[PDB]
Amino acid sequence: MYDAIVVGGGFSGLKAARDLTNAGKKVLLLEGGERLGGRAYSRESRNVPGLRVEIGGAYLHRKHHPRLAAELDRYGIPTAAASEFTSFRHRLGPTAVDQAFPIPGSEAVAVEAATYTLLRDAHRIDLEKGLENQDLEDLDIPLNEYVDKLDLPPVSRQFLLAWAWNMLGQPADQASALWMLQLVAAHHYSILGVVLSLDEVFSNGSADLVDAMSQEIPEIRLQTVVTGIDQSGDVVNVTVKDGHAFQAHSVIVATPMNTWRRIVFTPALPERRRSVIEEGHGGQGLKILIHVRGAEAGIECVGDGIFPTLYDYCEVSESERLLVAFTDSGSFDPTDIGAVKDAVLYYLPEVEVLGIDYHDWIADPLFEGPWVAPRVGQFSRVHKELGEPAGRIHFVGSDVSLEFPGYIEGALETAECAVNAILHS
């Protein structure tokens, strides 16, 4: 038996397991899959033999992600400032302007007014209290209705919608307007910052940092799927698909939120948390890497397409590249290459699709979902609590961060606080 069992080896689990270990605890780390990193997946392209692609979470911004910045600085991990955009091909109607910020002057007075409204509403949210504890229900409505109340003229209406589609991974009518605001608050009460935090990338991918952190964890078991976590006894008992149980004083659940319903907890979890855990969160972000000929470097496209955003990802050859599309999985079928062609040609009619590459996070039983985004109504009923301790069992990870939900910095933050919790118990 162990001081702690860390269940899940994404960034959250890895930090906790490392920090407890360095603090002198006897820690075991249990990972269901055959790799470490979780939703930070860097592998080789399915399209381009020999090329390494980020299939999940890639970007960072130091001023917003100090914890991540410290990890990179600790292990000397190189980051490069992300591909600049020299070329704009929006689908925002004829009055829009082909630059990074495509709102035209004719819309400025409306943008000014909406900027005040968006920021006033976001200033409502205090990021330490939980979205259920601040009388924020009037905000917890479908985003399409929220944006309809703002009454924005065409370019900015659709610019806001397209980036809200990309970032939330939900179509406008499934997204919570209050979650959109939670992101604005996360970024220092900035709308712009939600998009400008696409600031840096790992020169050699997330795997660098995954490896540096795991180097410092002495006991890791891959292919070890947890199926029950039982704290009826004096000492927590962790049960597993094929194998002898493991036992520890503390357990940290560092697995996706949408997977918790596949573990048997004993006793059953506090009763507030239970419907949300069953239904899961609404996140459906679909990120597609598209292999293309005919595209020049630097293209960014935002607009009303089934891909709200489509932009450069990297150079493949002198005539070939990868672009990246965002849309959501219950709106687009990534295996319908003709669909993909139509979505792309919509913005970029000169460009031939050579192939596509994605991960079905939803279909993956180790995840059942990409990054968190609540269903309308969920997080103003229960939110802070989904990541509070239940007995000797802690809950951590991006999904349950109040400070940064959906980003690595969130995975790292939630583990700080759990590690600290345990160190005092």
Next chain:
Amino acid sequence: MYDAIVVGGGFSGLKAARDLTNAGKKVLLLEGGERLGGRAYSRESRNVPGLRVEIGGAYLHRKHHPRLAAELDRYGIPTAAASEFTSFRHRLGPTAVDQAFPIPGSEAVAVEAATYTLLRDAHRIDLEKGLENQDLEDLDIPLNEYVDKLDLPPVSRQFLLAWAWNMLGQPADQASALWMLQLVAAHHYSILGVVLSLDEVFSNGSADLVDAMSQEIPEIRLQTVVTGIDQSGDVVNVTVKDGHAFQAHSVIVATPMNTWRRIVFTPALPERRRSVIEEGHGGQGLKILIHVRGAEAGIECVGDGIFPTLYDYCEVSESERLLVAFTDSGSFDPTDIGAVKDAVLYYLPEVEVLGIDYHDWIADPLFEGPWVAPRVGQFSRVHKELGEPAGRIHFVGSDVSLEFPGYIEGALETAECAVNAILHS
């Protein structure tokens, strides 16, 4: 004797005198000078024989100035959309960009945040209550300190300051930050709108509308300076520099605010109003028409010069134009043509000054000031009341508008309410 005496024949006096007359009152209009229009002065250029220039208030914007729009529509007065700007020559440092909106992206996140602060503060002001009745003292401080608290990066700091200098007619340390906000509220809670209301001009100058309105006033006396307004008796007694008094049930003071201290009121005015009336308001706007060779059409310059703004006014010849500078009278001496050359060359080094043209509103005893702007501290002590009736004597005009101070629309608004007041008495 008359139902009403209207004292002053700027736009405020002219509307009142006309509306009372049309309502069937026996009205006399008394004007101290030799022309009608007041601070709306259109005469011939001192520089360009035969050319008609606006020396005072020229611009309008229909959506913000419905009363003005109705006057223009009533008399079929043509307006032309004001000279467009094709050419930018700012002095905002090396990171600024030569277009109408010169803030660079590097400053966007700061602009966003200040936009929220500026608009939150302006939303504090409710335009019907008066600036002294809303607990707004924390705002009634020097603008330089306010803008220092906002902590803006160079381009936008100086862009805001330069336009606040132009619009308020005061250097930053003499201007009330709360007045700056009053203007933002006046324009529908818009910062941008304060500058975008430079939208239209009178094709043939303000005089058109001055003449249409005066056509409908049957009794006007020019060169008739009022020196005492005495309402001790049953009927108000109006005394005059050289001449027999005039008498009326009602008197409307439609003269500048900074002139009221040159009239003897009986009884003396309510005691709150009296210090402000003595000291006067702080407005020192100085608008200079500059006759130039070497300038092309379309130039707008904003920057840190002794002229915060310098831009095209109109074509004189194919090689000659007028520009317009704004600055303030206690900072620049318009008769120092070398000073003017330096101020201009600062922004426009290729341009030769041929001459200048201005009106000393301050030195003019019929005005003693250009448009209103309070001294720091004044309008959060007394404001609404300066334009409330004192006995049978009413007070109207741009200076005392809560809705639009410094614009014609304000002169027109304050006269509506006085005319209505009288019609019910």
